[PDB]
Each structure stands twice: as structure tokens, then as C-alpha cells.
Amino acid sequence: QHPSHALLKENNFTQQAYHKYHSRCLKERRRLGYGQSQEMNTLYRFWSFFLRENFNKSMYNEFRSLALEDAGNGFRYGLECLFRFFSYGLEKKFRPNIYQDFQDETIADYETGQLYGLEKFWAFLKYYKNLEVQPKLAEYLKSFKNIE
């Protein structure tokens, strides 16, 4: 199996294995450029699912930073995986710092003219079974009410 799947198997994550896998992913990105590495893409998906229960400040900051570099040049997959992590990760374990970040990246995504992040935020607030919202995102969400 591919490391992106084997490292998600229950109780099988190892540091030694993640380091080898992580390594070639960055080399492949550093070799082929933003949004051009299918191997790097497997790492975005691994991060998206892994951190939902398997959180790591180290991995999360990297995930976020690279996803935003890519998306700043038009390649959306990494950022799409990050919003999916935000929406489903916070449903499984609410972290206030990560909720604030979710707001921050949703606002930034909307103001670049996208709706993928805002819908994911709307989806979270709706299903999150239990929130204060930056009044700017508050108004953006009110206008989204005409869509979903």
C-alpha cells in the first residue's frame, strides 16, 4: 500500500516511516514546482485526514503554509484539503485556536473570489452540534444564505 494510506491505518503510524515518505514528497515538489507533484498531493490528503484525530502543531503549520503558497499561484488542492480538515476536524475535537484560524482562512478565501471555504465554514456551523463569528465573516455568511 502507498504510505499515504498505510500511515493512516489504526495504530501503525511511525516516525521513521513518515520521515521517508514526507521527504520524497517535498523533494518531488521542490523538483517539479507548485501544484505539479501528485506525490505532494497525496501528502495534502494524508494531513487532511491524519490531523483530524492525530493533531500536530508541527505538521499543521507546514500543511497550512504550503497549501497557501500553492493556492497563491492558483493550485487549490492543498487549501481544499485544509478546509476539509477544518470542517471535519473541529467537528471531532473543537480547538479554539484552530477555529479562529478556520475563520481567518475563510475570510481570506472569500476575498480572493472563492466560495469553497465559505461553504465549508457554513457547513461546520450548521452541523456543529453546539459560536462567535468575526462580523465580516458574519455578513459574508448572510449573503451565502441565497445559495445554501
Author numbering: 796 to 925, 929 to 946
Q: What do the authors say?
A:
La-related protein 1 (LARP1) has been uncovered as the mTORC1 RBP target that regulates the translation of TOP mRNAs through direct interaction. Among other target transcripts, LARP1 specifically binds TOP (terminal oligopyrimidine) mRNAs encoding all 80 ribosomal proteins in a TOR-dependent manner through its C-terminal region containing the DM15 module. To assess whether this uniquely repurposed fold is evolutionarily conserved, we crystallized and determined the structures of both fruit fly and zebrafish DM15 regions in the presence of a dinucleotide analog, m7GpppC, both to 2.3 Å resolution. Indeed, both orthologs adopt a structure similar to that of human DM15 with three tandem, helix-turn-helix repeats flanked by an additional short parallel N-terminal helix and an orthogonal C-terminal helix.
As in the human co-crystal structure, m7GpppC is bound near the C-terminus on the positively charged swath of both orthologs where the Watson-Crick faces of both the m7G and the +1C are recognized through specific hydrogen bonds. We previously showed that, like human DM15, fruit fly DM15 directly binds 5’ TOP mRNAs in vitro and in vivo. As compared to human DM15, fruit fly DM15 loses one net hydrogen bond between α4-α6, although the interface between α2-α4 gains a hydrogen bond. By the end of the production simulation, α1 had not refolded. A glutamic acid in human and zebrafish DM15, residue 801 forms a salt-bridge with K804 during portions of the human and zebrafish DM15 simulations; E801 in human and zebrafish DM15 also hydrogen bonds with the backbone of N796 during portions of the simulations. These interactions may contribute to the stability of α1 in human and zebrafish DM15 and are not possible in fruity fly DM15 because residue 801 is an alanine. N807 interacted with the backbone of both A801 and E805 during portions of the simulation, which would not be possible with G807 in the human and zebrafish structure. These interactions may contribute to the unfolding of fruit fly α1 by facilitating the stabilization of alternative states that culminate in the unfolding event.
